[PDB]
């Protein structure tokens, strides 16, 4: 009966070294991600990750090929509770949220002309949200001595919160603001959201978080929708992989609880690992499908950029990204690749030639 427990202990002891090596490699990757990967789109960030990984291979330091900081930091409950607060289910939104919630040492900048980050953070915070826009010194001092979370607008007209933002607290823990001594209740959080794309000192104290979509976002959206609705086998294997990951996390939590109970009172893991290894063998299929369905993505970027360029020649010819996503959905809601690109062209023409003059 103890043979299975001994085998599990031996497997854990053997995998501890690989876990530690992957931990330090993934920590390098994650830190360099929240620093140098917060203001660039997907294509150049992919090239930069390629160069970074080839330099790491020159250094030859052990890491994880399937590295994902999303499961490293954000659990499922936190991800759902943040997705219901206003944010989408997209990966870029999840990762910049992770950058925001990991920016403890330097205040997390909220660059959003659409002002969605301020709304979602206020919805998450609740009653503690206090909004200002750059009297105001007295309001900030009152908020500091009260203990409410402060979000300040109009970041382009900012130099009086230097000590507070640099945490120059004086302990006997006091805050020096203006020309008087102030106190901090301890529940103080200072955040900044703006809409105007910044002084160099402000850049130093903040970590830049980007929101603006682009043609890289177009490629990401078309790839996601293709993998999510084009191939039902892809949908079923993605659902099986997600369920297997959730089951593995639940089994790890149950095993930890069982170990704690055994410590207090003094098979399944192998099957879960085998199922996970069997399910994670479809990554090359996803890569091949992405390679096949990439000319459609390039043509999609070309079409969207062209339609944006028609808006340059006349101010009454705007093009909507939501409309483009809707028509991409509509061409397939009702040679597979050649036929689907042909139908996408026909649908886009027949739906976007109704809003143009004859010329």
Question: Whole-angstrom Cα distance, residue 257 to residue 260?
Answer: 5
Question: Whole-angstrom Cα distance, residue 82 to residue 78?
Answer: 6
Question: Whole-angstrom Cα distance, residue 305 to residue 307?
Answer: 5
Structure's resolution in angstroms: 4.1
Asked if residue 240 lies in contact with residue 279, where contact means CB atoms within 8 angstroms, the answer is yes
Strand partners, 150: 130, 190
Question: Whole-angstrom Cα distance, residue 221 to residue 288?
Answer: 18
Q: Which of 96, 100, 195 is nearest to 154 (CA)?
A: 195
């Amino acid at each position: 009966s103890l043979t299975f427990e001994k085998e599990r202990w031996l497997n854990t002891t053997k995998q501890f070294s690989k876990t530690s090596q992957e931990l330090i490699g993934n920590c390098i990757i994650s830190s360099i991600y929240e620093t140098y990967f917060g203001h660039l789109n997907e294509r150049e960030r992919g090239d930069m990750l390629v160069i970074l990984k080839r330099l790491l291979g020159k250094f030859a330091v052990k890491y994880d090929v399937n590295y994902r900081f999303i499961d490293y930091l954000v659990t499922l409950d936190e991800k759902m509770k943040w997705l219901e607060c206003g944010l989408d289910k997209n990966d870029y939104f999840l990762e910049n949220m992770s950058i925001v919630m990991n920016s403890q040492d330097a205040v997390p900048f909220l660059l959003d002309p659409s002002s969605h980050m301020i709304t979602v953070i206020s919805n998450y915070y609740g009653n503690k949200t206090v909004l200002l826009s750059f009297g105001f010194v007295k309001r900030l001092e009152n908020a500091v001595r009260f203990g409410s979370v402060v979000i300040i607008q109009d970041g382009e007209f900012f130099p009086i919160i230097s000590r507070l933002i640099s945490r120059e607290f004086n302990h006997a823990v006091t805050v020096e603001i203006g020309d008087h001594e102030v106190d901090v209740s301890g529940d103080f959080k200072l955040f900044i959201h703006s809409c105007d794309p910044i002084p160099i000192f402000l850049r130093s104290r903040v970590r830049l978080v980007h929101f603006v979509t682009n043609k890289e976002s177009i490629e990401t959206r078309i790839f996601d929708i293709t993998l999510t609705e084009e191939n039902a086998e892809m949908q079923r294997k993605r659902e099986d992989l997600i369920k297997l990951n959730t089951e593995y996390r639940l089994k790890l939590k149950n095993l930890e609880k069982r170990l704690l109970e055994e410590l207090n009172n003094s098979k399944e893991a192998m099957n879960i690992e085998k199922k996970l290894s069997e399910s994670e063998e479809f990554f090359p299929q996803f890569d091949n499908l992405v390679e096949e369905y990439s000319i459609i993505g390039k043509h999609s970027v070309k079409i969207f950029s062209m339609l944006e360029k028609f808006g340059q020649f006349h101010w009454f010819y705007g093009i909507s990204i939501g409309q483009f996503l809707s028509c991409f959905k509509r061409v397939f809601i009702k040679t597979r690749v050649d036929e689907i690109l042909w139908l996408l062209y026909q649908e886009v023409y027949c739906q976007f030639s109704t809003a143009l003059d004859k010329k």
